[PDB]
Design a protein around this nucleic acid. Structure first.
Ligand SMILES: [Mg+2]
Ligand SMILES: [Zn+2]
Lengths: 124, 201, 98, 147, 245, 46
RNA sequence: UAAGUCGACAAGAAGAUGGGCUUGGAAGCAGCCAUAAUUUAAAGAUCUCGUAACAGAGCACUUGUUAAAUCUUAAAAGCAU
């Protein structure tokens, strides 16, 4: 019951074939599970912030130790060996093979900013 | 230099003869620098040159190779001539065995070229004179330097051949100097696949 | 390297043989559309147990067929000979064209 | 070289016409041959539906074309119940950052990805990442997603 | 304030810059040589984008028809035909073999607070690892005896590596027949059932790929040897036959 | 040719060279460009 | 910077997708709005050309070959042009 369209919702304008009818909304449970997780990528007034925002962040921060204010280097600049071990097993193989793809997206994002930056410095 | 370190592969038939340091007395100068006369003989002919003395040649007659080296890489004078002396020897070896060639293409309506003999202007017995009709009111005729063979497979195509690249490419530049390629119709004399970007209209 | 004048190439070598390294590089220099243009290519891979002398076959559009050893001459030397014969054909075409 | 042309045509509307005539009639290939040939390829699509085509012209004017599924932008707009703009065609948002033309649920997107997977050249990509590429275009046309 | 001697915990002293893709990519292959028991070596010859997608398309379609009766995880997507960097990948084998983390001694490390904490630098990108592979590679004839030396002649020019999370001969038959079919041992898919295989783009891409060699559990394997591995139906059945005796 | 006091490269093919320098004169700094002949520049007078 | 720096050369530089709007036409590239994604060895809803509009040639970027054992790149300062 997490979807807005109940079982039977007629999908308007999705059947380009002539000898066919528009698709019909199938049950919610029958739908795959990844569909319910692919939506993770979607992302005076200033005075009220300093009076409240500036004070609350400093409280949760607890600037007494240097571990909370640590650099926190992004994954695209680290050097610690990934979770790879010899003859670790299938459970470790897939897990090791998942981080190699995680670092992939990290480097992929670095190129966008650089490629977008180089193009900006040439079209002043 | 990264070209001087590269050994010079001497193909079969070529013979390199390295002379010894000498100094030709010049009354106008107080101290001449020693040089080395290098003779490169082979099937097509024989070329010569005088290299500075600071350049050392390790003539390896066993494996048919000769590597060049200077006495000091920190000197600008020795670094420059190191690569230049290598480039000239390369042309000599590959020029006395295979030979150097140059092709000239004559574009333009009414442009022709024929090889004839002009005994009245022969700089030496049997000199070939390339006759060029390039639209001028007078006939253009140039004598090939001693050591070059000029031919025209077609009226609009000249073929120069010689063992010295500097002499071959320099004579082709004298011919092209009569009609330089124009950007409006491509008319001119193109040397070795030279091209010109035409205009819109 | 000029591959336009090359009709077909037939190379036979062993993968684990250190002398066949130059042969592998030669296969990569060929452009992608070499097959669409009509150039036929055949590659024979030898077993690892027994290693036979690597063979490199080259043929131009003028009937010339070249055969060179992959051991003595390195990749820098094989590219040389293929360019020499392929260059004279480029000039030969211009002389007889137009 | 073998040039390629891009043109959008109707389902069964194959005849000398701006989308067809000047698209390939100037190159040299037989136009009428393509019209009568496109009808056989498209004989089960509703009359008037847009149909992208990638026609390839080999040397000697021997043409061959591979039919392609309808545009995704046309499917989203046609599936988002957007208001038909000028000329009888649904239009997207002029300012996707502010304006909103429609809202499509995640379940609707799942069906839009399957129809697009019918293409062979696009059948290898997983369907898990294919639904995110279409959601990536909704932000460019001003269509929000509701779970 | 962070002191000068303080070093991030997730960024120990590396032998070379870590931001560059050279060392960042080396760390990837290092873990791939340990996480992937079965690895096949290929050679791509100027394959176009459309051709690459077509080649990887038949794999996803072919590898999806393999059964999973033993209940193992759905190993049907982690198999990728990834193109690697021959130069950097050549050093990966050196490190995994000529470097042992146990040969490193712990040293005091200063945190953000300044307290001395003992730490050990065992990352493959460390200065100790860089010194081990070099001194180990100094000897030439001795390296030819190891598994690395047996695979060094293959890491020449462009090379593509296929990664399989586990040693499953069933998946090998579905991949070895789409990438390097060798009938009758591994016949190619039929035309009446897999028309996508015999396409204008796919057919022109498979001819550019060549199975130069393969690596299994850190052991060199020849082309003819991979047929013996893939020839086996399943690994568990091979062990049961030896038990009947 | 445009004679300036501040010669600058106007594209990727422009090259800075010092020509006409011999035993009698010091020469001038040129901006030679094979692509566009409008990028030709010189620094100094005779 | 031998984990091949620098330079050159060879190939690649994708797909959803002619983004939406505008316009006689706007397909990366007149202009306006947006520019979380996806898949890759890598690939900006696009940096310079090109087209009436497509097509097409380059760049960012990616792999390979050649090859340096005091030899990469940039800045500042000193004296010169
Ligand atoms: Mg637009
Ligand atoms: Zn310029």
């Amino acid at each position: 019951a997490i979807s807005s369209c109940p079982a039977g919702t007629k999908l308007n304008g999705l059947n380009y074939f002539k000898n066919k009818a528009d698709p019909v909304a199938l049950p919610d449970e029958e739908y795959p599970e990844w569909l319910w997780r692919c939506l993770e990528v979607q992302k005076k007034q200033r005075r009220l912030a300093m009076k409240r925002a500036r004070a609350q962040e400093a409280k949760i921060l607890a600037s007494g130790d240097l571990e909370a204010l640590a650099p926190k280097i992004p994954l695209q600049k680290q050097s610690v060996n990934l979770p790879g071990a010899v003859n670790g097993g299938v459970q470790d193989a897939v897990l090791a093979d998942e981080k190699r793809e995680e670092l992939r997206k990290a480097m992929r994002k670095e190129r966008k900013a650089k490629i977008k930056e180089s193009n900006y410095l040439k079209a002043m | 230099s990264k070209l001087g370190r590269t050994p010079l592969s001497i193909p079969p038939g070529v013979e390199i003869t390295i002379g010894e340091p000498f100094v030709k007395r010049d009354m106008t100068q107080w101290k001449q620098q020693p040089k080395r006369k290098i003779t490169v003989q082979g099937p097509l002919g024989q070329l010569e040159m005088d290299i500075p003395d600071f350049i050392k040649i390790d003539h390896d007659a066993e494996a048919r190779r000769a590597t060049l080296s200077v006495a000091n890489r920190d000197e600008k004078e020795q670094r420059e001539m190191w690569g230049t002396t290598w480039a000239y020897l390369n042309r000599f070896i590959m020029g006395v065995s295979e030979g150097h060639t140059a092709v000239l293409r004559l574009v333009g309506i009414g442009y022709r070229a024929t090889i004839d003999t002009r005994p009245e202007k022969e700089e030496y017995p049997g000199q070939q004179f390339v006759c060029l009709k390039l639209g001028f009111s007078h006939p253009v005729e140039m004598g090939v330097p001693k050591g070059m063979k000029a031919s025209t497979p077609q009226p609009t195509r000249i073929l120069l051949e010689g063992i010295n690249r500097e002499q071959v490419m320099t004579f082709a530049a004298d011919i092209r100097r009569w009609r330089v390629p124009e950007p409006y119709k491509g008319k001119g004399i193109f040397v070795n696949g030279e091209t010109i970007k035409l205009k819109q209209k | 390297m000029l591959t336009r004048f090359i009709t077909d190439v037939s190379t036979r070598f062993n993968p684990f043989s250190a002398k066949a390294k130059a042969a592998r590089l030669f296969l990569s220099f060929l452009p992608p559309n070499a097959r669409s243009n009509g150039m036929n290519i055949t590659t024979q891979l030898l077993p690892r147990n027994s290693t036979e002398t690597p063979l490199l076959y080259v043929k131009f559009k003028d009937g010339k067929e070249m055969n060179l050893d992959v051991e003595n001459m390195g990749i820098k030397s094989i590219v040389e000979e293929v360019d020499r014969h392929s260059r004279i054909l480029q000039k030969q075409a211009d002389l007889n064209d137009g | 070289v073998e040039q390629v042309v891009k043109l959008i045509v109707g389902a069964g509307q194959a005849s000398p016409s701006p989308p067809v005539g000047p698209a390939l009639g100037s190159k040299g290939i037989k136009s009428m041959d393509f019209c009568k040939e496109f009808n056989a390829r498209t004989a089960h699509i509703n009359t008037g539906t847009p149909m992208p085509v990638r026609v390839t012209v080999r040397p000697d004017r021997s043409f061959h074309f591979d039919v392609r599924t309808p545009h995704t932008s046309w499917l989203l707009l046609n599936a988002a119940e957007a208001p038909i703009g000028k000329g009888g065609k649904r239009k997207g948002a002029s300012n996707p950052g502010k304006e909103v033309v429609g809202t499509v649920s995640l379940k609707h997107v799942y069906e839009i990805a399957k129809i697009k997977q019918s293409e062979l050249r696009l059948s290898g990509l997983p369907l898990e990442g294919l639904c995110r590429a279409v959601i990536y275009q909704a932000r460019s046309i001003g269509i929000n997603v509701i779970p | 304030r962070l002191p000068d001697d303080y070093v991030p915990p997730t960024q120990p002293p590396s032998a070379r810059p870590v931001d560059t893709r050279k060392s960042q990519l080396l760390r990837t292959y290092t873990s791939m040589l340990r996480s992937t028991p079965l690895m096949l070596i290929f050679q791509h010859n100027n394959l176009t984008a459309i051709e690459w997608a077509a080649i990887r398309r038949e794999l996803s379609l072919a590898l999806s028809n393999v059964p999973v009766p033993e209940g193992a995880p759905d190993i049907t997507s982690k198999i990728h035909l990834q193109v690697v960097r021959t130069r950097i990948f050549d050093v990966a084998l050196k490190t995994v073999e000529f470097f042992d983390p146990s040969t490193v001694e712990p040293t005091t490390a200063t945190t953000a607070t300044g307290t001395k904490v003992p730490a050990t630098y065992n990352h493959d990108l460390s200065k100790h690892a860089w010194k081990a592979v070099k001194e180990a590679t100094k000897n030439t004839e001795a390296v030819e005896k190891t598994v690395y030396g047996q695979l060094a002649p293959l890491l020449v020019g462009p090379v593509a590596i296929l990664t399989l999370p586990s040693v499953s001969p069933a998946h090998l038959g579905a991949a070895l027949s789409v990438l390097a079919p060798s009938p009758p041992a591994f016949p190619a898919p039929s035309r009446k059932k897999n028309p996508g295989y015999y396409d204008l783009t796919c057919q022109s891409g498979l001819q550019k790929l060549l199975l130069v060699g393969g690596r299994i559990e850190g052991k060199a394997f020849d082309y003819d040897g991979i047929k013996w591995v893939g020839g086996i139906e399943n690994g568990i059945e091979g062990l049961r036959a030896q038990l009947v005796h | 040719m445009k004679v300036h006091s501040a010669i600058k490269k106007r594209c990727e093919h422009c090259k800075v060279v010092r020509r006409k320098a011999n035993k009698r004169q010091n020469g001038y700094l040129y901006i030679i460009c094979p692509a566009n002949p409008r990028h030709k520049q010189r620094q100094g007078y005779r």
